[PDB]
């Protein structure tokens, strides 16, 4: 019944009533605007802050694409008033700003249990149970009270306090504002009031007072806020959890009486608050929301656009060779396959890889909970140096299986020196299983002065980022073959791990390919270490709304995205008729690395390509 | 997260608050009382009638086992009052009756969105979308009204009106009581008021007035009722649908004004209203509810008991041989396998078959929507008559995959005359795929005077139930081998199809095995044709709450249950030293069948077994 209501299936047509009229969705054979259906409920402080926080509304008005529509439903019994409240909030935010986006926003006062469509089934069956998704509740219990008092809570920013609450009951002690250290609480959760001083200061003072946790209650008539640091506050690390709730007269009266009070934290599973329909009418999951900002939706929308632009590229003329079709990957072997390439790949001067790393199930919940590198090695002649050489590199997403990327690896065509070859896609041995689908697309460029690769010589590999990292690399002297018109450097470099300086994965590390000991060739990961360095690559293929730190700018790569190779032309630098020398070296802050604890890692694959 | 929350997985421990105290469920290594969790919502007239209809409460108080517990939650915002209302209704029903059952009923005033447990996830993810499950709603729309009016509706009894509503909009005409024929409505749904005359009379008069449907509105302050016939009314067949709703002043005022009024019918998907935990802590689906009566729960509970009693039997000492392990079945081939039986099965005088017919997925929604016969044939020597002979017969359930039966087929042991044999489980070729798991259990009986079968001779087969049915059967003359102490008749007979007399599947047909033309041997399907003939076999293995007419008493079989063979001893009738004659014949009402239209079918497999 109702057809397929799982990710990847088409979205059946439907009709809804809204303050502006009848909103009708009908599948089309063409590509149109993507849709985002959002279900709002007053029982979650996450959505309340989403719709009340000015930053979230500004992000929605600014970063939302111009080719996306949003529909809002209310699962609460006050849907009629809830829709009007949301519309008023949006209009007030858009005041003295753009107003075209309003035409793409629709608010349905209809009750969820009266739609008469397939939407409630999707909302119920697409349960999130993850980051900032799932009603977080706080239960206050006292012997005097005949029953508990249940309220909403919003956990602090994921990037500030990594400590998590425990299901075991806690105590509760009144500490007023909480920004002045007290004698001691003896492992009793603090009951503090927002305002007066800083939030970070409150948490720090409570931790210094021997407190297992803190609970900020908003003053009457106020709203919950997202707890986060500001500059100097973030360097300091706090090892206790915290959350913000509303004000309850009962707990205050009990504390004044001196009666014991206990507090418990729970996560009640809820219904999906977001689900998207792609530009082609395909149902898609919107991932997780790390913190209450509408930006997470916009990024998802951006991805949809890219996906469409991707699906148009694959439809173009090209010779397709399928290597993997949902082939399972896990362990050392990973995914091994053997293919028979066309008889003659010489005319094809362009080679691309279309890759899709999905999970065993359609839903994202059945995916790996970590990001692990993936490498594609190719072997066509064991008696040649090209065997087991890396052809492409990718990075998995945090519990997402919608990844679909296209990478240009044309200069590595000479590695395929045999009509029959073997391809091995490998990841971390201890990684959870994945399902890889890979296709090689051969094509001829539109360039008039077409050039064809004929030789690929590996230059240097990676290694541990230690003080001896640059001591293992020696100058390579090579002579250029005749009938050569162009020389290129093709290097795939990625830093991993953390050290005293958080280097490797979050390091601004420079890599130099000195040529003829006379000219530099620099690759720098400037975006590394930035809070949102990897958030700008979603239009380019990055998978957004991942269950992890997918926003941090990494060194040379990003989560849920292929590693775009670094290609440089050095035909001018080299002496086309004579010998040349090349030497690699990596540096940090302009000096060799000196990691005293937990040294990082550098995975590199470098090649020198000669064109006819 | 939350472990496995699908059918067949264990139920994690949990705690809930109720008017009587703290209800705690903790898995145990032993077997205890089964549990039934029911979610109630005021938005469904089905549950409202369930909790307001006296018949349903009486059925709950009478047929509910004494080893079952029921917990009730309310998904509505009035849970506190809803639980008290349910408790008051139950107590009033139990007045002047038994009160022990009350100790096994618990009512939780806690809101569903505040449980803090795994129950809401199951309720949301176990969507029903089927018979009398899924909010049936009626939408009244008029040009004068700025918005539609949505109300609850309860479709008439499934066994009375098979006509179904259409998603297309209808009209609405006021016809008062509706038990007096009018001029004509011209394909306009009738708007009638309950009371004054009979419901069947109202529907008949409306159909005679050229009406596409009828809608009964209950008087203000009244409640919806289940539409059904009474004796003479049921013989007559009506080809239009009908439903009962509440009274709306707006539609009445509009009709008085003469303004056009349109009515539409929809089915909004909802959350699961019932889910059960077996005696061993395994989550189990409760199937569908054909009409609003609590009996459907009780039957399910009964099944649980049987299941436990079944699982204890399998744990007993026995030689187990697995033939199928979730082997797929579909098409003509069905499921074919080859097994190597023990070296010597002579000492094992008892042979049983443990069978489980599940679906491709754990959920019942992925199951076949029809009941189809299943037969197990065995071949051990192509040069022997025993090849391709039937060993066991089963009947699938309407969209249920919890079937697990144990059938005694010991007299058919001689069919296994070779250590290696081939087993073929076959169903209707056009049937949806199933997954069969079969095990043969050999055991030695506790009887002191043990007897061992050594010869099985087929006697007669089935055929089409026509006037020539008995003309194709001739007397079989057989001589008994020496060293024989007992002779048995083992016949598996099943009627199928319908005819002018509804014979075959719903026929009281007698089968006679005349022996030596001197003594009868009668098998009669007395329960055939009864409304609840097959409802009494749930404790014996019948799968209850099927998506079909599983309550009707069939001829010699029942839905979701094995066909228990008919075994009779005739050692006295036969001349142990001499020849004997046997002749089969089937009769209806004491006479040969004379089906003028759509003749039925009789599937029979008969054997004469000789014991040492
Ligand atoms: C190739 O570059 C290296 C490294 O210099 C880096 O880039 C410079 C522009 C500057 O930012 C340095 O701090 C970087 O480390 C050159 O060798 C180094 O040159 C620097 C001065 O630029 C000197 O202090 C170091 O001792 C040199 N050696 C090292 C770092 O090992 C090199 O000269 C460049 N090649 C050329 C210009 O042909
Ligand atoms: C075996 O039974 C048949 C069938 O009789 C049936 O059972 C009877 C008790 C009675 O209910 C009949 O109406 C049933 O049909 C006997 O043969 C028939 O006997 C009936 C009278 O009982 C007679 O009218 C029929 O013509 C007979 N023949 C038929 C129905 O084909 C038969 O005699 C029985 N065998 C015995 C007693 O040894
Ligand atoms: C969402 O729920 C919160 C929490 O109940 C509501 O917050 C209330 O807001 C009103 C209006 O400012 C205050 O008077 C109350 O004191 C607040 N707390 C309560 C009622 O507990 C909030 O209004 C709700 N939002 C919507 C749109 O209904
Ligand atoms: C379930 O919903 C129905 C339909 O709304 C309620 O029926 C109402 O019952 C009251 C009390 O007898 C009447 O006064 C109303 O006229 C009825 N119809 C309405 C309100 O539309 C019924 O009470 C509800 N049950 C519970 C337990 O809340
Ligand atoms: C916290 O407890 C520790 C236990 O070792 C104690 O040394 C310390 O002084 C306490 N700090 C307070 C009460 O601020
Ligand atoms: C590998 O290359 C060598 C080069 O001498 C060639 O002789 C050999 O046949 C090649 N092997 C295959 C399997 O193509
Ligand atoms: C119903 O319509 C049919 C159309 O053939 C007509 O013959 C019949 O008289 C009508 N019956 C009524 C209006 O009762
Ligand atoms: C079948 O039975 C016959 C009886 O003569 C015997 O000769 C033959 O070997 C048997 N076949 C098998 C496969 O057991």
Author numbering:
A (entry chain B), B (entry chain A): 51 to 662
What does the report in the manuscript say about this coordinate set?
The structure of zebrafish Ngly2 was determined by cryo-EM, showing that it forms homodimers and that its substrate is accommodated in the cleft between the protease-associated domain and PNGase domain, where the catalytic residues are located. The 3D reconstruction, conducted with imposed C2 symmetry, yielded a density map at an average nominal resolution of 2.7 Å. Structural homology analysis using the Dali server revealed that Ngly2 possesses two additional domains in the N-terminal region, located upstream of the PNGase domain. One of these domains, composed of residues 58 to 185 and 319 to 343, exhibits significant structural similarity to a thioredoxin-like (Tx-like) domain found in peroxiredoxins. The other region, spanning residues 186 to 318, is identified as a protease-associated (PA) domain, showing structural similarity to domains found in certain peptidases. Around the twofold axis, the Tx-like domains dimerize via extensive hydrophobic interactions, burying approximately 1500 Å2 of solvent-accessible surface area upon dimer formation. The domain consists of two jelly-roll subdomains stabilized by hydrophobic core residues and disulfide bonds. S2; 3C). In contrast, Trp59 and Arg61 are replaced by histidines, His422 and His546, respectively. These histidines could form hydrogen bonds with the chitobiose via protonated imidazole groups.
Peptide:N-glycanase (PNGase) is a deglycosylating enzyme acting on asparagine(N)-linked glycans on glycoproteins.
